Design a binder for this molecule. Sequence first.
Ligand SMILES: CCCN(Cc1ccc(-c2cn(CCF)nn2)cc1)c1nc(Cl)nc2c1ncn2[C@@H]1O[C@H](COP(=O)(O)CP(=O)(O)O)[C@@H](O)[C@H]1O
Ligand SMILES: CCCN(Cc1ccc(-c2cn(CCF)nn2)cc1)c1nc(Cl)nc2c1ncn2[C@@H]1O[C@H](COP(=O)(O)CP(=O)(O)O)[C@@H](O)[C@H]1O
Ligand SMILES: [Zn+2]
Ligand SMILES: [Zn+2]
Ligand SMILES: [Zn+2]
Ligand SMILES: [Zn+2]
Lengths: 513, 513
Amino acid sequence: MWELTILHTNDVHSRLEQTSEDSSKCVDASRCMGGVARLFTKVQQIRRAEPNVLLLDAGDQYQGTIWFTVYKGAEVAHFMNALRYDAMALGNHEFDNGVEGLIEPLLKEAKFPILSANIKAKGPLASQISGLYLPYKVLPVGDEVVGIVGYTSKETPFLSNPGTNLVFEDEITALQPEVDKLKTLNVNKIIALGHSGFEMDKLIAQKVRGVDVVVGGHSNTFLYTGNPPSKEVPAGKYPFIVTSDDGRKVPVVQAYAFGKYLGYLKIEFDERGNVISSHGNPILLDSSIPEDPSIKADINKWRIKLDDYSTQELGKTIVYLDGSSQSCRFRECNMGNLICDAMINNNVSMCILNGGGIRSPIDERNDGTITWENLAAVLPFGGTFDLVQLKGSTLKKAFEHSVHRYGQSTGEFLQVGGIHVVYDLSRKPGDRVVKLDVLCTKCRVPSYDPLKMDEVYKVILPNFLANGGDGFQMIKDELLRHDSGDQDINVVSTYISKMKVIYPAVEGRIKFS
Amino acid sequence: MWELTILHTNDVHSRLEQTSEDSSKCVDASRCMGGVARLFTKVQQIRRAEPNVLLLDAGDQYQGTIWFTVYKGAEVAHFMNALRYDAMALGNHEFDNGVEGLIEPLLKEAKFPILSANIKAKGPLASQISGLYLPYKVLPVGDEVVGIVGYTSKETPFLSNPGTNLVFEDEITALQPEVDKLKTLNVNKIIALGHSGFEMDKLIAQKVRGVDVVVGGHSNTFLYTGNPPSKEVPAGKYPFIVTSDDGRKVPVVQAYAFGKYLGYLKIEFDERGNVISSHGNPILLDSSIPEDPSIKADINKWRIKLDDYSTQELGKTIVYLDGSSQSCRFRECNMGNLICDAMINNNVSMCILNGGGIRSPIDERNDGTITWENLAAVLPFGGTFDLVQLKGSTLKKAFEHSVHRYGQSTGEFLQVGGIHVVYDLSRKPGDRVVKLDVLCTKCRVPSYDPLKMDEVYKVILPNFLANGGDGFQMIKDELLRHDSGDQDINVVSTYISKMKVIYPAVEGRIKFS
Ligand SMILES: CCCN(Cc1ccc(-c2cn(CCF)nn2)cc1)c1nc(Cl)nc2c1ncn2[C@@H]1O[C@H](COP(=O)(O)CP(=O)(O)O)[C@@H](O)[C@H]1O
Ligand SMILES: CCCN(Cc1ccc(-c2cn(CCF)nn2)cc1)c1nc(Cl)nc2c1ncn2[C@@H]1O[C@H](COP(=O)(O)CP(=O)(O)O)[C@@H](O)[C@H]1O
Ligand SMILES: [Zn+2]
Ligand SMILES: [Zn+2]
Ligand SMILES: [Zn+2]
Ligand SMILES: [Zn+2]
């Protein structure tokens, strides 16, 4: 009989400073949430109350806000060290700044094991990272040992910039020998901590024999048993119970994203390291839990650098800039419309944009003041808006891909400019596009004329889509001409200043049967 | 066996200086048309070829271009005197500058009879304007007399500001005693010259016993026998033959508008002043007819004052600003979209605009340069964009009115901003609106939601529509609140400068089944 409490965050994405209800910049501080300082209070509060506790992270601490743009990992290592994190799995966004952008700020400065069993190293890089990350860590909790095995998304080479001298083996295949190794090492209790998404977490739980619990991330999954405290609608109960082939009931947990919730999972274990009972719920980190003062003071010490890099007004918004996943990945969101307008205004009649790239909404309640900061949250990656030459057939395929797996918060949903697309989800994937009228360019007056397969159109789109990202291989493998455009933020920054006061709308660009 | 040639212009609307194929400012002078100087050449050319000729005008020289804004009638009297016009009927736009702004520049300076039989004067104005205009004029042509009887639109009190001491009696009723008078005065030939439109011209021809020929205007009707020389599609043959009740075939003519065509009509008359034969066609005044040099020199000697009209680009257009009647009064024209955007940007989610108020397109081929001159052609009246508070039922009625007599180049067709209307012309007038989704204002993110009858909307529209013009009595008799807005031109002038480079489009705001 042993009691362990697992506390977990996943996909925080640089929300060190407290955010709004929608994870945008904290506007109303009385009705504000999350943050590293507020989490310190709840973590500390749990730590004293429970006997054996583990604060874990399932990746994606990188990107999302100006904190990352400025410190590039210095904030993550400093504040995760401050919060005394027990362990963290490598996320796909941890490789965004190349291999050194992982080695120099985080891997060298972290006072905690950073894990990953399915990443193997070769050649020059082989000895550089050797020992900086481990496949597993056997933490001594009380008078028991707990083995944590890490894993990072198999698709990280596509999804980010991990490098050429790192190899991403299959999760379940690379995890099993490491779990079996730990079992022989008399490690009765195995947590698997990884960044591969909910569906992959569930088969890990069902397939990897010996994993007592799965703590994942990547997909921003929100799980809840009961009536949720906020706008987040749950995908299942907390914990999600997977019945392994072993005959065990393996709990699977996720904490949404942006440090809005601290995942709490209490576990009763037997003499042999088997879950007898488990229960919990992700704790909503809201104003009812005070931000720890000493830790918040350090955030303010690290804020004056961030202040200079976004302490002035660029434009004003009278509409709420809806840059939320719930809207931008399922329907035409006004933020996507704004960015597309900004793109064409920077030069072409068509713009295409992956909803996945819309990382943050912008709140108009702060009188509409749109600062450099509000916006480096919407566009945190520093890509560009590149010119392309596409065939009508090529564009029809991309729209077909746009809703190929619709309804799974995937980022391949397109936000458009100068395109009027209508979808029918009742039909089979591959024949769901019902209309695609595009804005004419040879014409003297622009009018929407249906797309012709055999005609060549000039579309402006992010570097990510030109690179063939989000599975848009047809764009990369069928384009006629690609051109290096201007920096993504500066396209929206120059447009906002030019407009002075903005007000985009859902005007029927994307429609559904 | 008498031969009379009637030469006629109608609705020139201040196109003294030659214009483009679309009556906008002359861009390419080698492919340019119309104008007072070019007309002088063709008129003089006809005059020396034919024996008995009459140069007549059926109204509307006033308003249209900056020539009228600056000289307010000095140009009309000076150049019509130069062109040696024989007679002119009063048009509805002649009263645009009140009753004094007609008498002071034109009525006192014209070296030709200005006619109108259906305008009667009362009280103070009675003796002021006594003799300045006449109901008829008996011109001596060769060794014969020709009686011309004038008429101005019955609805001029609504259509413009004709003062308060002028009374507009019915045309056919006021014309008949004057034609009967002339017949008793032994005046065998009667040509009726008036500004009431084509349909009214045809009933005048059928009904007023004794009228040998009708030469009209107001409706910009283009008539042609054969293959037309330009974009103007004809409404009938030239001359249009009306069969009068007293067994005569009465010819009816019109020469489109803007001085693009000089209407030519050949007439064989009998001993008793009866048309035996008649034939003609409106002559396309193009570069193939040279502009008379002496007269063009005078146009340039005056032009010098008009030159200080923003001879610097307020803004640039990359699209052709389609401000033509053919588009703006039948479908959603990009010019109407531009003005509506300018109105909401000015200071509300909805804008409505009468297509009639779009008096001129703007040509983007002149390096895209938009000047105060160009804008004065689109918006020549000096109205204002007023705020209104109308209920859904009231707006639904206005949209029904919009297409109540659709297809007759009437100005009550609405151009919109933040409104998405769909019409079905197959249905009965009063049941023609199938969709009317409006842009929400109480919402945080603007989205198009269907209009509710019992809800109030805050629409921005011209003062012309607010004081119930174009038969939109429902606007004037059902509004909840009206507010004095900014000047029409200055709303578009401030918007263009703010945007720097504009590019409106036909984006589906107005649609049809
Ligand atoms: C230049 C491109 C910048 N990046 C990052 C990035 C990509 C690839 C390399 C990279 C360099 N190289 C080497 C070139 F030689 N190979 N590869 C680097 C960085 C990106 N840009 C845009 Cl526009 N969108 C991006 C994006 N990354 C991701 N999304 C979106 O994120 C969505 C998922 O979001 P989520 O569910 O919260 C899961 P997670 O992102 O929280 O892990 C997707 O559907 C995408 O649409
Ligand atoms: C402040 C309003 C300015 N005006 C002029 C005007 C109206 C009325 C008074 C007037 C002052 N008052 C007194 C107020 F206390 N009563 N009445 C003066 C001037 C106007 N404004 C706008 Cl927005 N549109 C106008 C307009 N006039 C006409 N259209 C349009 O012209 C179309 C027809 O064009 P057409 O076929 O070429 C025939 P014609 O105009 O060549 O004769 C119509 O359908 C209208 O839409
Ligand atoms: Zn993430
Ligand atoms: Zn991730
Ligand atoms: Zn006219
Ligand atoms: Zn008229």
